[PDB]
Amino acid sequence: GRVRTKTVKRASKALIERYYPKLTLDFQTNKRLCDEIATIQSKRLRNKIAGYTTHLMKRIQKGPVRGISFKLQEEERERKDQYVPEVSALDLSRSNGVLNVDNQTSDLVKSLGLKLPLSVINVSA
Amino acid sequence: GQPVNDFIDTATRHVLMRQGVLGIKVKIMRDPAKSRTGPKALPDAVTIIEPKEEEPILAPSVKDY
RNA sequence: GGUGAAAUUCUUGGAUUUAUUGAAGACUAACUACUGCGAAAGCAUUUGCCAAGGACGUUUUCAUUAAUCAAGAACGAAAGUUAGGGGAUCGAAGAUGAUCAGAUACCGUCGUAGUCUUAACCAUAAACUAUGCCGACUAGGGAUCGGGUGGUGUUUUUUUAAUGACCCACUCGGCACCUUACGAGAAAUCAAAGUCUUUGGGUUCUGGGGGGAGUAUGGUCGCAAGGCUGAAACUUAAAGGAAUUGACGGAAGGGCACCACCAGGAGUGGAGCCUGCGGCUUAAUUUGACUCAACACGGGGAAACUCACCAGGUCCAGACACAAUAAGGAUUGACAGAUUGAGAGCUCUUUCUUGAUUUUGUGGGUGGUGGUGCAUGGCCGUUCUUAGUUGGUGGAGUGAUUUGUCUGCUUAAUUGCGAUAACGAACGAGACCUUAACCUACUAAAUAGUGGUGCUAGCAUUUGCUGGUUAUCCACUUCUUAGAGGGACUAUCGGUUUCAAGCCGAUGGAAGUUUGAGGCAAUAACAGGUCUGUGAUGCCCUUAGACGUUCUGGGCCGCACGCGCGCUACACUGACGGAGCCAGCGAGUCUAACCUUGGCCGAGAGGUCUUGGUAAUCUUGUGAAACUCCGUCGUGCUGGGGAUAGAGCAUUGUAAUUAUUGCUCUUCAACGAGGAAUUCCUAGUAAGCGCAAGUCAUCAGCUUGCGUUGAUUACGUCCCUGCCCUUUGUACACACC
């Protein structure tokens, strides 16, 4: 019956969301830090909040936890997503400069498109 | 629980009408923010002090006097 | 055999079982499907005749020959009109055997009419798709059956060829199916149940609230059962359809609970007693409460009081307004005697006093533990030891309503992880508060202790041990106290899960079940209890010979009997006598006799003289009890048990008889471990044991707490009794009593 209530969980998630580079991975200085940077009425509640807060970083440093963005996980993510490969995936260099479409695509570009380097593949059953 | 003793106040009054007696029960809670003595918030209320942002480089050097 | 169990029945005359060989008895098990044919009823292994049919193909033919149809016909599920055969599997009936209160039923065994003749049904079915037939249009999709068309398709073999079978595409015609809802509908739902108040394609049949009633009567078919046709009198305010929310189910799924069980423990129900309830009795045996949720409950352990009941005796404390008597006296009180339970001037004899406040009448006032808790307020109990409850905005539906408030996993928890036509919230839970655990860390205590120092005792003597010394003095807070704090958050590690919420194991820790236990505690409700707690109260009653109030006695306790909560025992793990001696929660008196130390007297109960205490100071270390040694007892209703009863001594009380209670001697009953039933309980717990407080003047076998000793058994399940959620059925909504 050690399930934490939503009061502990929402406060601990709110603490990590804005105070990641101040808390460590041990409960002793985490409960010491929560006395100044947070206002908790009872000693039993702040021990439960700091205990769950330390438990949350027992897996945050293990891997990215869904639903928590702690001001450190953000800026390496909008650093990562501008993946510009040095070569394209649609420029015909791993091929011989010619894309190997089938017969039905050849008269498609013959009817409406302009002349391009194509091949003919006998695709069937 | 204990917040009922702190913030909740009650009064019971018997009025006398023609048909009999009507009972009046009034329950009022004041918000704990205006409380002068005792706790100033609910026991399950947690407030987070907003942190102050800092710039990353901070120009490594020494200043003397 | 046969059944939930059994029984009927057959069995050395060999049952049942095994083999071989025969003979009569629907139909065609598997194949068998959201597949085919037929007008419907209906029709399944073959093979052969006899006619029939749909669909497709068609540059064949007729040319309106058609659609629906009163009258009129044909065809037909099965179950018995009637007349041969063959031979029971099932039960009508019938026989039996069970079950049951009965069981003429369900279930078991057997068996006649009863889907096998050849020959009629008058023609009845929930004969159903509960949906007439013909024609046109309106929307997408994938399958499938029959036919046809096409493929520089596959396979079968001669190499490909011809077929066949398969694959792709299309088309016609079918049995259907899936998605939406433009559209319909009251909704359920529906590609028709659409194209309908923007109401007309053609046509046939039926209905006009529920019954009476498919009845009466007439006809007709009818050797029969019975069909087909078919009213009225009278009666009635609903009957009915679909859906929503609850409740319920001998419905299903998921969980939970020692007010459920499991495994056990201690018991209760058996005995004596005392304590409530009923019944009986009585002058009265006051009364409320009757499953959980009445019955050691009304804080209800009643001698008077309480007290509401009974037999009697007083008093007005009936205020005020009006009227009348009335300073030639409105009225009150009383000596003595009578009277009275009575030293009540109650009332009377007598004659004193008082005097304008009183008396009488008219209105009212007041009081009532008089009635109504089914007129109410407040309080409490219960539903309900569970986790549930509700707005806002948005979505669905005509609407009641619904979603949010949930598939799954997890939790003690609607606790969370999450998924999501919901998002964001509120109450409940949790959080919180109190108490018990840890602190050689702080704050310092002659109203708590500790060590040394002085004085002094006993032994040893060697410098030691056990003490005493109200403050002799000094020092400290480990023990005790109480302020502020700290500490646990499941910490660390390992293992499991979707890799999360979590769960389990180990270590460390005073503490790992929410740390143990409480307090508090939702929305809605009960004709739950209380008018006998209240100067809380409406309405009704009474109000002077009072239902007010007071006083004297009695009753609440009365006992052929029944029930509930308990106490003491049935003995040797014990009784009795000495010895050791070990706690915690608390209470205690200024104008009043409270808790009582100590000294003396007494067998005891108790008496007497003082003292301390308004209290961490004194009672008090409450020197409690079970417990532990040593001894007596010796398997015997015995020395277990102390019920019942007799005599005496004391205490409280105005009063003790109907024994208040305490003590002494004697009397020495039932009871030999308690049937059906039934209660409570998972760790400092049950159980054993006593102590303080409430009530108290006296009485505790009761209750609220406390400490002493201290276990067996589980770490589960829904089997019994209940509870929460989901699905489901409902003719229930006073809600399965």
UniProtKB/Swiss-Prot annotation, chain A:
PROSITE patterns: RIBOSOMAL_S17E (PS00712). Component of the small ribosomal subunit (SSU). Mature yeast ribosomes consist of a small (40S) and a large (60S) subunit. The 40S small subunit contains 1 molecule of ribosomal RNA (18S rRNA) and 33 different proteins (encoded by 57 genes). The large 60S subunit contains 3 rRNA molecules (25S, 5.8S and 5S rRNA) and 46 different proteins (encoded by 81 genes). This is Small ribosomal subunit protein eS17A. Component of the ribosome, a large ribonucleoprotein complex responsible for the synthesis of proteins in the cell. The small ribosomal subunit (SSU) binds messenger RNAs (mRNAs) and translates the encoded message by selecting cognate aminoacyl-transfer RNA (tRNA) molecules. The large subunit (LSU) contains the ribosomal catalytic site termed the peptidyl transferase center (PTC), which catalyzes the formation of peptide bonds, thereby polymerizing the amino acids delivered by tRNAs into a polypeptide chain. One of its GO terms (biological process) is ribosomal small subunit assembly. Disulfide bonds: none annotated. GO terms for cellular component: cytosol; cytosolic small ribosomal subunit. Keywords: Cytoplasm, Ribonucleoprotein, Ribosomal protein. NCBIfam families: PRK01151.1. It comes from Saccharomyces cerevisiae (strain ATCC 204508 / S288c). GO terms for molecular function: structural constituent of ribosome. Present with 30900 molecules/cell in log phase SD medium. There are 2 genes for eS17 in yeast. It is found in: Cytoplasm.
UniProtKB/Swiss-Prot annotation, chain B:
There is a cross-link at K40, K52 (Glycyl lysine isopeptide (Lys-Gly) (interchain with G-Cter in ubiquitin)). It comes from the Eukaryota. Ubiquitinated at Lys-52 in response to stalled ribosomes. Ubiquitination leads to activation of the No-Go Decay (NGD) pathway and degradation of non-functional 18S rRNA: first monoubiquitinated at Lys-52 by MAG2, followed by formation of 'Lys-63'-linked polyubiquitin chains on monoubiquitin by HEL2 and RSP5. It is found in: Cytoplasm. The modification Phosphoserine is found at S61. Belongs to the universal ribosomal protein uS3 family. Component of the small ribosomal subunit (SSU). Mature yeast ribosomes consist of a small (40S) and a large (60S) subunit. The 40S small subunit contains 1 molecule of ribosomal RNA (18S rRNA) and 33 different proteins (encoded by 57 genes). The large 60S subunit contains 3 rRNA molecules (25S, 5.8S and 5S rRNA) and 46 different proteins (encoded by 81 genes). Present with 146000 molecules/cell in log phase SD medium. Component of the ribosome, a large ribonucleoprotein complex responsible for the synthesis of proteins in the cell. The small ribosomal subunit (SSU) binds messenger RNAs (mRNAs) and translates the encoded message by selecting cognate aminoacyl-transfer RNA (tRNA) molecules. The large subunit (LSU) contains the ribosomal catalytic site termed the peptidyl transferase center (PTC), which catalyzes the formation of peptide bonds, thereby polymerizing the amino acids delivered by tRNAs into a polypeptide chain. This is Small ribosomal subunit protein uS3. The chain holds residues 161 to 225 of 240 of the full protein.
